[PDB]
């Protein structure tokens, strides 16, 4: 298979605007949302149809209870950070955990936290320790590393449990996650540069580049973002400035899902 990943996010806000949740938790498989929970609904709900069709109500009821507990702990932790920073007003607390099953069979695993959208604590599951960015994170690092058993639990969940969940969700939505829609690629001119655009492709992982007489020139190329089209497919582009004083052989190169494509500009 291609590379796949499973990730869970948590977002906590200390003094949210009226109606805005103070806690949100969303899971992803690759770029697809699969689960959602917030402090307003207080319910864990599917965000992909193949998740709802393969997970019994017992699953959603159980993790709804766990998420209500995780919501309270997140509030206590954000309360503690903002007190240690001596910060007033509204501030954000974020967490991301997940794993990757690479194409060659190897695995990766990660867990980290953020305060106000900046790295705060990063877990190293090989050295079994937390990397702190400042002294407020250092104080939290000391308390978390004193509970050695929970560090071992995180290593096992990242390396064993997370991978098992990923393979499980991968089978549930294999019609979506493991399909291939090749891109449609074209070249047009705009004032003067050559824009090579692709659209209608899945998975979103695509590599587009321009070459001049068979040689890459990355500093010259302008790369566009891979953007969702809204129908499950994606689109992207890449432009390069045209030299009006000398003729050169420009060619857009597109690689997607094991297939390489070359469009020579006449």
């Amino acid at each position, epitope marked *: 298979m291609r590379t796949h990943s499973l990730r869970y996010f948590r977002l906590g806000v200390s003094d949210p605007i009226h109606g805005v949740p103070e806690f949100i938790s969303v899971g992803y498989v690759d770029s697809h949302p699969i689960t959602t929970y917030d402090s307003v609904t*207080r319910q864990k709900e599917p965000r992909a149809p193949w998740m709802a069709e393969n997970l019994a109500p017992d*699953h959603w*009821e*159980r*993790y709804t*209870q*766990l998420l*209500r*507990g*995780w919501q*309270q*702990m997140f509030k206590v932790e954000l309360k503690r950070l903002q007190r240690h920073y001596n910060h007033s007003g509204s501030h954000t607390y974020q967490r991301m955990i997940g794993c990757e099953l690479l194409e060659d069979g190897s695995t990766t695993g990660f867990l980290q936290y953020a305060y106000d959208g900046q790295d705060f604590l990063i877990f190293n599951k090989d050295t079994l320790s937390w990397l702190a960015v400042d002294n407020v994170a250092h104080t939290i690092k000391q308390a978390w590393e004193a*509970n050695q*058993h*929970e560090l*071992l*639990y*995180q*290593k*096992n*969940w990242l390396e*064993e*449990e997370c991978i*098992a*969940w990923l393979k499980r969700f991968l089978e549930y939505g294999k019609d979506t996650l493991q399909r291939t829609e090749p891109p449609l690629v074209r070249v047009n001119r705009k004032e003067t540069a050559l824009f090579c655009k692709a659209h209608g492709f899945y998975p979103p992982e695509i590599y587009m580049t321009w070459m001049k007489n068979g040689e890459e020139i990355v500093q010259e190329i302008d790369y566009g973002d891979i953007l969702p089209s809204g129908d499950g497919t994606y689109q992207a582009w890449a432009s390069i400035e045209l030299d009006p004083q000398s003729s050169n052989l420009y060619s857009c190169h597109v690689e997607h899902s094991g297939v390489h494509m070359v469009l020579q500009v006449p």
Partner: antibody
Amino acid sequence: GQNIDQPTEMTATEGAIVQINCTYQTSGFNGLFWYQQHAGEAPTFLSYNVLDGLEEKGRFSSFLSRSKGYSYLLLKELQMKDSASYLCAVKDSNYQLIWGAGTKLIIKP
Amino acid sequence: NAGVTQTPKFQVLKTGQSMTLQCAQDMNHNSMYWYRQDPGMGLRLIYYSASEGTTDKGEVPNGYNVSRLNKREFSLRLESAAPSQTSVYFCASSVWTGEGSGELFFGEGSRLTVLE
């Protein structure tokens, strides 16, 4: 389904060594616990294992093998106060605790 | 200091009688549980409370109800006692739930005998 298996009863001599086994078949694994429960009293936490290997805690040691799906609680230099039931419990993928029936340890003075 | 305090220690009941078991913890824990222990089998969860403000059924909820009155207290209710509910009931608590290594702290236990 999910089952936890441990011997019903073990008898050993004072001053000797006893090994209490616990095998588990569960959907997912988030750690194995050992608890001590004296007769007519509440269980109390003894140990936790989640990675492979042996961890020591005084006279008690706890081993875990995730691949074989079994653990043992090792009691050295047995004393009469070690007479109790020893409960093993496993957290599954949904963080639910699945309890073994418990092993009653009888110590011959 | 006190840990988990549950009452009563013993109780005889007639079939159909009502009964409420009390449980309080002073360890500032968030998760509380009600177990029943029977010969020949492991502890079975009746009900649990992952945190203050939420409760959910365990493995054997039928015949029981619970109330997470506050962060400290978690009562178990037997509305119509049945002979099958003759057991030893244990209330427990943990700092949080949904974590691997957090252990349980048990109360002293309540021995109920229900008779026709």
